[PDB]
Amino acid sequence: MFDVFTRVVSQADARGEYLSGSQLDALSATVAEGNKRIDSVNRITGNASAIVSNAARALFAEQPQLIQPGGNAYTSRRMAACLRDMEIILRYVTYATFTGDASVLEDRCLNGLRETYVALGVPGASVAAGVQKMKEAALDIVNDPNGITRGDCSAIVAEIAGYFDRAAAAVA
Amino acid sequence: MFDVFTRVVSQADARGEYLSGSQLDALSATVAEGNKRIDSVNRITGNASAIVSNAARALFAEQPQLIQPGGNAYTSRRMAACLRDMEIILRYVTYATFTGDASVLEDRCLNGLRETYVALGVPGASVAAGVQKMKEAALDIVNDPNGITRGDCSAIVAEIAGYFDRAAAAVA
Amino acid sequence: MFDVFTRVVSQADARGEYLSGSQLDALSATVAEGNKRIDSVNRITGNASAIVSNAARALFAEQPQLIQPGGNAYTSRRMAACLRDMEIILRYVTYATFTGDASVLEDRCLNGLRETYVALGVPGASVAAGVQKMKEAALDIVNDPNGITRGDCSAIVAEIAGYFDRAAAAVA
Amino acid sequence: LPLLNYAPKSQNVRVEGYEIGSEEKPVVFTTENILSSSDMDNLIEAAYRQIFFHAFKWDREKVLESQLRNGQITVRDFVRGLLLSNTFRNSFYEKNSNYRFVEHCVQKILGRDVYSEREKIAWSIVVATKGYQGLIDDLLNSDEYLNNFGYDTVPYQRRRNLPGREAGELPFNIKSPRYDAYHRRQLGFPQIVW
Amino acid sequence: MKTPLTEAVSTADSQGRFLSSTELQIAFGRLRQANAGLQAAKALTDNAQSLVNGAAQAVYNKFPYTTQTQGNNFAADQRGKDKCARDIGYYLRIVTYCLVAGGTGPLDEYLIAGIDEINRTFDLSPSWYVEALKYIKANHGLSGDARDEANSYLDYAINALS
Amino acid sequence: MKTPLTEAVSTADSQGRFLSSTELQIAFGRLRQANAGLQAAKALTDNAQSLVNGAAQAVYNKFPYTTQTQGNNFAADQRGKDKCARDIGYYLRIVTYCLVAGGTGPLDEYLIAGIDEINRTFDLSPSWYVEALKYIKANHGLSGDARDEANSYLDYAINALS
Amino acid sequence: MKTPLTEAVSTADSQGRFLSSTELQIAFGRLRQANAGLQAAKALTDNAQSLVNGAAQAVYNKFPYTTQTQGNNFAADQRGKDKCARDIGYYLRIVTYCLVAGGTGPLDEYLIAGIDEINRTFDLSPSWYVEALKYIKANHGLSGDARDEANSYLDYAINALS
Amino acid sequence: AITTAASRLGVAPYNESRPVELRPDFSLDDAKMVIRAVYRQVLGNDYIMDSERLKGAESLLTNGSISVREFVRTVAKSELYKKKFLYNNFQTRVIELNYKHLLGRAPFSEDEVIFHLDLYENQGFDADIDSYIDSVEYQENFGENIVPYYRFNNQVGDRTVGFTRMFRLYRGYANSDRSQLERSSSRLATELGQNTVSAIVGPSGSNAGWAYRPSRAGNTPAKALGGTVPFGQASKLFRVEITAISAPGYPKVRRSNKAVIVPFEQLNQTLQQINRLGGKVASITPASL
Ligand SMILES: *[C@@H](C)[C@H]1/C(=C/c2[nH]c(/C=C3N=C(/C=C4\NC(=O)C(CC)=C4C)C(C)=C\3CCC(=O)O)c(CCC(=O)O)c2C)NC(=O)[C@@H]1C
Ligand SMILES: *[C@@H](C)[C@H]1/C(=C/c2[nH]c(/C=C3N=C(/C=C4\NC(=O)C(CC)=C4C)C(C)=C\3CCC(=O)O)c(CCC(=O)O)c2C)NC(=O)[C@@H]1C
Ligand SMILES: *[C@H](C)[C@H]1/C(=C/c2[nH]c(/C=C3N=C(/C=C4\NC(=O)C(CC)=C4C)C(C)=C\3CCC(=O)O)c(CCC(=O)O)c2C)NC(=O)[C@@H]1C
Ligand SMILES: *[C@H](C)[C@H]1/C(=C/c2[nH]c(/C=C3N=C(/C=C4\NC(=O)C(CC)=C4C)C(C)=C\3CCC(=O)O)c(CCC(=O)O)c2C)NC(=O)[C@@H]1C
Ligand SMILES: *[C@H](C)[C@H]1/C(=C/c2[nH]c(/C=C3N=C(/C=C4\NC(=O)C(CC)=C4C)C(C)=C\3CCC(=O)O)c(CCC(=O)O)c2C)NC(=O)[C@@H]1C
Ligand SMILES: *[C@H](C)[C@H]1/C(=C/c2[nH]c(/C=C3N=C(/C=C4\NC(=O)C(CC)=C4C)C(C)=C\3CCC(=O)O)c(CCC(=O)O)c2C)NC(=O)[C@@H]1C
Ligand SMILES: *[C@H](C)[C@H]1/C(=C/c2[nH]c(/C=C3N=C(/C=C4\NC(=O)C(CC)=C4C)C(C)=C\3CCC(=O)O)c(CCC(=O)O)c2C)NC(=O)[C@@H]1C
Ligand SMILES: *[C@H](C)[C@H]1/C(=C/c2[nH]c(/C=C3N=C(/C=C4\NC(=O)C(CC)=C4C)C(C)=C\3CCC(=O)O)c(CCC(=O)O)c2C)NC(=O)[C@@H]1C
Ligand SMILES: *[C@H](C)[C@H]1/C(=C/c2[nH]c(/C=C3N=C(/C=C4\NC(=O)C(CC)=C4C)C(C)=C\3CCC(=O)O)c(CCC(=O)O)c2C)NC(=O)[C@@H]1C
Ligand SMILES: *[C@H](C)[C@H]1/C(=C/c2[nH]c(/C=C3N=C(/C=C4\NC(=O)C(CC)=C4C)C(C)=C\3CCC(=O)O)c(CCC(=O)O)c2C)NC(=O)[C@@H]1C
Ligand SMILES: *[C@H](C)[C@H]1/C(=C/c2[nH]c(/C=C3N=C(/C=C4\NC(=O)C(CC)=C4C)C(C)=C\3CCC(=O)O)c(CCC(=O)O)c2C)NC(=O)[C@@H]1C
Ligand SMILES: *[C@H](C)[C@H]1/C(=C/c2[nH]c(/C=C3N=C(/C=C4\NC(=O)C(CC)=C4C)C(C)=C\3CCC(=O)O)c(CCC(=O)O)c2C)NC(=O)[C@@H]1C
Ligand SMILES: *[C@H](C)[C@H]1/C(=C/c2[nH]c(/C=C3N=C(/C=C4\NC(=O)C(CC)=C4C)C(C)=C\3CCC(=O)O)c(CCC(=O)O)c2C)NC(=O)[C@@H]1C
């Protein structure tokens, strides 16, 4: 996988040149925001169960046919598999937030997942809707100011939102 | 795989209601011929080697090109493979007769068999002819009146014939 | 495996009591020793090839019977295995130094190593002599005053020397 | 009857990779390291992910786990018990054809993709002739398995990621879910939304 | 799926042999039990609404907090009660499926597999469903083999839950 | 036992390589966190008994039926109250262990693995312990890195129970 | 590409777990090291040409036969000298990459992996590159964390070459 | 007795070796034979240099001033014995060596370790040696005039645990009790503490898998708890001890000694795999049924 530093390293090595001053300054600015990235990762991790469960309940309320008999979320095993999948997507989006680059999320979770859900009959659009609900809940947890040093976390929130809709597009 | 009961159960669970009175009556009807079903399975199992050997001999008699040098049944390994596939197809139709549902036969024996025969150069039509020969021998053996409490076995014979036809059509 | 903190934690859980103030202060003292420990690990790691090669050269100079034909270090594969064993023992000594506990060295490296050497005919006493030579070389490297903040690393050096002693007693 | 001869195919695992340990090197979960109970939990979960992708507690084999913890059985024996377990038979054998059961066996025991359709065809007859456990033991006693994972190491997808590349081959749990379109249409999916 | 017929063919297939006398005896046992199981399923189906209503009411009586405290996992509102009655209906319907099939297989594949995950994820206490199943035990009005088989499935669900 | 140092050594040992600058930075992060972890464990330990009794009282308040319902699994008698306070004390003590060790290792080793079987067989609602952990979060009175790490362990336990 | 961040994610993913406080401390250690790594990379970059030229001259001085004997693997002609300068520049550039990344990953997959077969196939003596790296160590003029980390990478390359 | 497996073990030379008795009015060869037998058996077949020989004790035994039992006591209390067996050994190893030399048998249980360790710590080494020699067991086996010898064969007050532990203490005829693989480590501490036994592995030249020794931890247990369930369908289970595993090389091979519980149906495959890994089979013991 690649992280935020290593992405720039890989482009520079492909071009076979040293990192320029501007690239090093950009990485220094990335280092400057590392605390916000770590605590956003921590906040999502500490609220993962609530995010997954609330998003799932909202999804089955908006799409009752998922949980009605014959639905893809009907029966306990299918319902638990769906919850697990929500949690897996959330965990890999936290990985991507932690590294600062989407390589782990694509390589380990997203790439080929659409074909997996096509092969299983899992409605990928409904998975995308679930991922959007997780995104909404997760952005609320990252953005709440209680019990934390106040600051501007808009850049990291935008990066997290980008990872989440990337997951939603990948499963659709 | 399913059995005569689990198939109705799976359909009802997919549509999410209880088995109707008519469905329960049909299943009670099916357990009324259960002794005849066990008799048919036992008779085919007790004469499996004879059925396979006689059907193979007749098939190579009317289709000499299979056993001519260069034919698909030529050489000991390929000929043993042909005898093996006949025995396996007969065994899985006995499984289907036992459970009362063709699912085992479909799932384990006929799923992908035609494509495999195409890839190997195995003539599927000749396999269909051989399993039709096994059908005539097995249905004669099931319908043998000697040594058994006489009764009407037309329904179970029709079910077994359907399994054998389904196995023939999977490769034909 | 265990590190310096988890050893105290495991003992405390076995007693079923909170860590005492003395134990917390001792762990704080260990924390204050952390930079010196990291420096020792880095210094042994940076000279690992020199340590292994010089110790092996000295060992085969003092014990020529190892490298004469018929000796255990004779032939290229047995010589390569010997050098590799020395590097592995050094590596696990650095693992124990890094964690502050000898559990990694005992469980992953020294468990069964004596029995392995006697089963293969590897002279364990000569392995202990080579480990001794790596010990003196590595302790001289750790105590090098050039190019490092001066301070007292005697406790770290004693701990590292203890790890080497364990390795040498175990292999002999 | 001897197995059909099938030609190999160019693969990363067939060729020397000069691998240096990194984030893409699969973690070696081995009992040779005298693992604590929590490290054994990690090793056991690695085996569950390799064999069942995910294991619900209905899918867990607590008796097998206790046996592996006590040293009664090796890691390879635990892998065999997972493959012979009810979860594996119901999810991967029952819901798939024999050919797509060889795949899900080559992929997660040997840690490599199948060479071709011919390999799938050749190994698919083994269940019906030598038995299910016959296939499991043939794959576990194979030179490929023993040379790669031995007795004490949990198998894994081998050489999935080449160095420097952003993405390697698809993980087998993504590439090959328990079932495919055959059992999908037997179930009645895909379902229309709204 | 766990059912006498499916396992007989499954165990014979997994070791690559023809059905023998042992699988025939398994089928004979299935034939002996089948009529009682079908009759039990019919009896449980006929007053399924009364059984489900009584079981849900029994859960509410033993656990009054479930009808009082507010929460998504509780039945204080009509939405919670509807979810609860639907869950009890699932339990009873799958029990009838097990009676028809002759084994705990419908419960295993439709309800038991990953029920633990459900209850933990949505904060549904398994003791609630245990009390519902004990009401179904005590009020199904079955006798003979029908009662014994049906109680075995209900106790199977209870043992999985508890 | 998950810690920054043991994980770094385990990663290096699996890769069969010497500890690099990556593992050195892992140790540096452990050093950066360790002091605040140690004073978090001290502060939690000094106020441990009061925190445990307050969490017990909070659980009894949110779930009143636990104090007036008969049964081995409830706290309607002194025996049950004692076992409840002991359980909450176990949670608190192992959280202090996690703060000392710098990871969830003590929780995984001593409490997380197998807690679901315990809560199922002894019919103990994980929501009670979740409420106890919420009270401990709300009342441990920590700040900064001590607060963050401690709340991470308590939330790890909450997520494990939910 | 071994770095602290990617290894923390690999450890968490290999256990199927979210990112706990252990991984967070790994990231904190990475943040502590990163500014020094970036300034070390900048210092090496600005002095790259002089360092490469001096390292090439040090290799030529210590091994004069390289500038005298003919052969594809030697620097007797301009072609060999350009190849040698290019190789030494490769080493310096990849070391700066490692300083940026925070691990040996750039060296591991851009340079270290397979370098043995490179040296054997083209009859390139690894002692040449060892002396070039030694010159870079002696003349990079770094101090503090910058030096320690850069020197760790340089000794990592030297250890891989010997 | 031990007949078929005597040569494979180190028992065959002791089968035709009669006990060395000093008769009343003995000749000088009888005295020298007693001296030679005592040196060989009490000092555990160590080479005895001329400078280390107890000249005075030999003279006294030759003269009849001391009995065979007294000469054995003098040898066991000598500085030579303490240098060879006491000063560099864990006292449990000292007890093992005492039982092997003075009584010709292995310790039976932890109670003997308790008694001898307490007696050494409270009254010294000489008193402990005296307890070995003034014991009822010594008197009934050797008495006053017979050199102690290895008691391989079954006797009246035996336990079979002692028969198994004898081959943990005795490692062949051309072996010297200070030249064994385990060196100075106690061979029976775990066994006596846990009241367990090890499969008997014979001496080097008669047994290819002679070098097998279990590690400190990560050892396969003796019995197959769980039966054949983890191995699918299986008839019987066997614990196989394998030594000298080297072919794949590190890291594929970590410990050269490995014990595996395998089904009967995989025994052929297990043997082939052992041959491939270059190993030697030390023992095979039924593990189930
Ligand atoms: C946007 C995401 C929200 C936000 C974040 C924010 N955090 C900080 C500062 C810090 N956060 C931490 C985090 C931790 N300390 C620990 O020991 C652990 C446990 C493993 C964690 C997660 C740290 C160390 C700091 C620095 C010290 C401090 O307490 O300030 C900031 C301040 C700027 C900075 O980057 O340092 C900000 C902005 N704040 C908001 O307003 C958002 C809701
Ligand atoms: C068509 C299949 C043929 C046929 C069958 C037939 N059989 C019965 C009745 C029984 N057959 C059995 C069978 C077995 N008993 C055993 O112990 C075993 C071996 C394990 C077997 C296979 C049994 C138990 C019965 C019931 C008792 C009885 O003998 O009557 C019938 C009678 C009706 C029924 O359904 O039971 C029939 C009709 N009869 C034919 O004419 C066909 C050629
Ligand atoms: C939930 C929001 C939706 C849903 C989910 C659903 N998924 C499955 C089954 C599988 N999902 C996966 C997932 C992954 N494989 C990977 O390797 C990773 C990345 C690391 C992921 C995300 C797989 C492999 C399966 C099949 C195997 C298994 O489930 O154990 C199911 C059930 C399908 C079945 O019966 O097998 C379900 C229900 N379905 C919905 O209706 C929601 C919209
Ligand atoms: C005999 C009637 C005809 C015939 C057969 C034939 N088949 C093969 C080879 C294979 N047949 C199979 C069969 C199956 N796959 C399954 O999963 C199932 C259900 C359990 C079955 C029945 C397979 C997989 C193979 C290939 C593997 C193997 O043979 O071991 C051959 C051999 C072909 C070859 O050796 O190249 C033959 C000859 N051939 C005829 O001419 C008859 C008409
Ligand atoms: C070098 C100082 C001495 C020496 C060494 C030597 N060792 C071997 C063979 C092996 N060494 C090991 C090592 C280990 N196993 C572990 O698990 C650990 C800890 C992680 C270690 C250190 C093993 C397993 C073997 C066997 C397989 C292999 O060779 O890799 C040999 C070869 C013996 C032979 O003939 O096969 C040698 C020569 N020998 C000397 O003379 C030095 C004193
Ligand atoms: C002890 C064997 C020798 C010694 C050690 C020593 N080191 C320090 C201080 C530090 N060392 C480091 C280490 C690193 N910084 C990096 O970036 C890297 C690579 C990742 C390493 C290895 C650090 C960060 C410090 C603290 C800051 C500083 O530069 O001083 C000390 C001082 C006390 C302390 O513990 O910090 C000491 C004593 N000094 C000797 O004289 C011994 C030979
Ligand atoms: C050299 C003349 C050209 C070149 C080569 C190149 N190849 C690879 C990578 C691989 N090569 C193979 C090939 C095989 N695998 C097989 O099974 C067989 C038969 C035994 C062969 C020949 C494979 C599978 C790989 C990938 C696995 C691995 O590299 O370890 C590379 C590396 C690509 C990368 O991204 O690392 C290269 C560079 N490249 C050129 O520019 C030359 C024209
Ligand atoms: C009734 C005894 C108690 C109760 C019930 C209640 N249940 C839910 C939610 C769900 N119930 C299930 C269970 C199943 N689904 C299946 O398909 C099957 C197997 C065939 C079972 C057993 C599931 C999966 C859910 C969640 C999904 C859904 O929205 O239905 C709720 C709502 C929980 C929530 O957060 O929305 C409730 C209220 N509540 C009580 O108070 C009773 C004591
Ligand atoms: C308190 C929040 C509620 C409560 C408590 C209660 N607990 C039990 C019984 C047990 N609690 C445990 C838990 C642990 N043991 C451990 O070792 C650890 C990990 C370190 C934990 C978390 C266990 C194992 C038991 C059962 C055995 C035992 O008694 O120790 C009971 C009694 C249950 C019974 O007697 O069957 C009770 C009452 N009760 C309430 O009402 C509170 C809301
Ligand atoms: C300089 C220290 C000595 C020297 C150099 C020399 N090198 C080569 C050839 C090659 N060098 C490399 C090395 C790399 N390529 C890479 O991509 C990287 C990693 C990023 C490295 C380190 C390679 C692969 C070659 C061969 C292919 C090529 O020509 O590029 C030569 C020429 C050898 C030949 O046969 O042409 C020379 C001369 N020569 C000296 O005398 C110095 C002491
Ligand atoms: C000489 C060619 C090589 C050599 C030999 C050497 N051997 C020992 C020690 C012992 N040798 C034996 C062998 C026997 N004792 C017997 O009773 C019998 C016949 C049944 C044999 C074959 C024994 C048992 C020992 C140990 C007893 C003792 O007192 O040592 C040593 C001494 C080792 C040491 O003192 O540490 C030596 C030196 N050494 C060489 O270098 C030659 C190649
Ligand atoms: C006291 C602080 C702890 C403790 C002690 C304890 N030890 C034993 C038993 C034994 N201790 C030994 C020790 C030695 N053997 C030697 O050779 C040497 C000196 C050279 C030593 C130190 C041995 C061999 C035994 C076994 C014999 C015996 O039991 O006396 C016990 C008794 C164990 C039992 O169950 O019998 C005890 C109690 N126990 C604690 O709880 C303290 C922490
Ligand atoms: C007879 C039913 C079978 C049989 C027996 C047999 N046993 C031996 C030898 C020994 N038996 C023992 C057993 C014990 N020793 C004890 O001290 C105890 C009680 C505490 C027991 C149970 C031992 C240790 C031996 C060897 C020592 C000795 O015999 O003194 C033999 C002789 C083998 C040989 O001569 O090599 C035999 C024949 N053999 C059969 O075939 C019967 C099935």
CSV table of C-alpha atoms in Angstrom, one decimal, chain B residues 55-168:
chain,number,residue,atom,x,y,z
B,55,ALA,CA,-25.0,-50.0,-20.4
B,56,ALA,CA,-21.3,-49.4,-21.3
B,57,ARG,CA,-21.1,-52.6,-23.3
B,58,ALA,CA,-24.3,-51.8,-25.3
B,59,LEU,CA,-23.1,-48.2,-25.9
B,60,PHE,CA,-19.8,-49.3,-27.2
B,61,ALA,CA,-21.6,-52.0,-29.3
B,62,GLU,CA,-23.8,-49.5,-31.1
B,63,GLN,CA,-21.1,-46.7,-31.2
B,64,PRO,CA,-17.9,-48.6,-32.1
B,65,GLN,CA,-16.0,-45.3,-32.9
B,66,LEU,CA,-15.7,-44.6,-29.2
B,67,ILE,CA,-13.5,-47.6,-28.6
B,68,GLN,CA,-11.6,-47.5,-31.9
B,69,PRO,CA,-8.0,-46.3,-31.5
B,70,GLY,CA,-8.1,-42.5,-31.3
B,71,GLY,CA,-11.6,-42.6,-30.0
B,72,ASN,CA,-12.6,-40.9,-26.8
B,73,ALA,CA,-13.1,-44.2,-25.0
B,74,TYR,CA,-9.8,-45.7,-26.3
B,75,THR,CA,-6.9,-46.4,-23.9
B,76,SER,CA,-7.4,-47.9,-20.4
B,77,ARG,CA,-7.4,-44.5,-18.6
B,78,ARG,CA,-10.0,-42.9,-20.7
B,79,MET,CA,-12.2,-46.1,-20.8
B,80,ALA,CA,-12.0,-46.3,-17.0
B,81,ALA,CA,-12.9,-42.6,-16.8
B,82,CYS,CA,-16.0,-43.3,-19.0
B,83,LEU,CA,-17.0,-46.2,-16.7
B,84,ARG,CA,-16.4,-43.9,-13.7
B,85,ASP,CA,-18.7,-41.2,-15.1
B,86,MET,CA,-21.4,-43.7,-15.8
B,87,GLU,CA,-21.2,-45.0,-12.2
B,88,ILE,CA,-21.1,-41.5,-10.8
B,89,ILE,CA,-24.2,-40.3,-12.8
B,90,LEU,CA,-26.1,-43.5,-11.6
B,91,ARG,CA,-25.0,-42.8,-8.0
B,92,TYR,CA,-26.3,-39.2,-8.1
B,93,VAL,CA,-29.6,-40.2,-9.6
B,94,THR,CA,-30.0,-42.7,-6.8
B,95,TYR,CA,-29.2,-39.8,-4.4
B,96,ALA,CA,-32.0,-37.8,-6.1
B,97,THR,CA,-34.4,-40.7,-5.8
B,98,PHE,CA,-33.5,-41.0,-2.1
B,99,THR,CA,-33.9,-37.4,-1.1
B,100,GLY,CA,-36.9,-36.9,-3.4
B,101,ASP,CA,-35.4,-33.8,-4.9
B,102,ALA,CA,-33.2,-33.5,-8.0
B,103,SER,CA,-31.1,-30.7,-6.4
B,104,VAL,CA,-28.2,-33.1,-5.4
B,105,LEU,CA,-28.1,-34.4,-8.9
B,106,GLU,CA,-28.2,-30.9,-10.4
B,107,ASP,CA,-25.8,-29.3,-7.9
B,108,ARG,CA,-23.1,-32.0,-7.7
B,109,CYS,CA,-23.1,-33.9,-10.9
B,110,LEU,CA,-24.7,-31.9,-13.8
B,111,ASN,CA,-23.5,-28.4,-12.9
B,112,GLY,CA,-20.7,-27.7,-15.4
B,113,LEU,CA,-20.6,-31.2,-16.8
B,114,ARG,CA,-21.4,-30.2,-20.3
B,115,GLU,CA,-18.7,-27.6,-20.4
B,116,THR,CA,-16.2,-30.1,-19.0
B,117,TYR,CA,-17.1,-32.6,-21.6
B,118,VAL,CA,-16.7,-29.9,-24.3
B,119,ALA,CA,-13.3,-29.0,-22.9
B,120,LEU,CA,-12.1,-32.6,-22.8
B,121,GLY,CA,-13.5,-33.6,-26.1
B,122,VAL,CA,-15.9,-36.0,-24.5
B,123,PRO,CA,-18.9,-36.6,-26.7
B,124,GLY,CA,-21.8,-35.5,-24.6
B,125,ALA,CA,-24.4,-37.2,-26.9
B,126,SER,CA,-22.8,-40.6,-26.3
B,127,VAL,CA,-22.9,-39.9,-22.6
B,128,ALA,CA,-26.6,-39.2,-23.0
B,129,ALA,CA,-27.0,-42.4,-24.9
B,130,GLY,CA,-25.2,-44.4,-22.1
B,131,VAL,CA,-27.3,-42.8,-19.3
B,132,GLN,CA,-30.5,-43.6,-21.3
B,133,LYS,CA,-29.3,-47.3,-21.4
B,134,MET,CA,-28.8,-47.0,-17.6
B,135,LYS,CA,-32.3,-45.6,-17.4
B,136,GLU,CA,-33.9,-48.6,-19.2
B,137,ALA,CA,-32.0,-51.1,-17.1
B,138,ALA,CA,-32.7,-49.3,-13.8
B,139,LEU,CA,-36.4,-48.8,-14.5
B,140,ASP,CA,-36.7,-52.5,-15.4
B,141,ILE,CA,-34.9,-53.4,-12.2
B,142,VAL,CA,-37.1,-51.1,-10.1
B,143,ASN,CA,-40.3,-52.5,-11.7
B,144,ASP,CA,-39.4,-56.1,-11.2
B,145,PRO,CA,-42.3,-57.8,-9.4
B,146,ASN,CA,-40.5,-60.8,-8.1
B,147,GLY,CA,-39.4,-60.8,-4.4
B,148,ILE,CA,-41.3,-57.8,-3.3
B,149,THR,CA,-44.8,-56.9,-2.0
B,150,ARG,CA,-46.7,-56.0,-5.1
B,151,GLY,CA,-47.9,-52.5,-5.5
B,152,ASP,CA,-48.2,-49.5,-7.8
B,153,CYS,CA,-44.7,-48.0,-8.3
B,154,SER,CA,-45.6,-45.8,-11.3
B,155,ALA,CA,-45.0,-42.5,-9.5
B,156,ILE,CA,-41.6,-43.4,-8.2
B,157,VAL,CA,-40.6,-44.9,-11.6
B,158,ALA,CA,-41.7,-41.7,-13.3
B,159,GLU,CA,-39.6,-39.6,-10.8
B,160,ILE,CA,-36.5,-41.8,-11.4
B,161,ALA,CA,-37.1,-41.6,-15.2
B,162,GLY,CA,-37.2,-37.8,-14.9
B,163,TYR,CA,-33.9,-37.8,-12.9
B,164,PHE,CA,-32.3,-40.0,-15.6
B,165,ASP,CA,-33.7,-37.8,-18.4
B,166,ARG,CA,-32.4,-34.7,-16.6
B,167,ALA,CA,-29.0,-36.2,-16.4
B,168,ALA,CA,-29.1,-37.1,-20.1
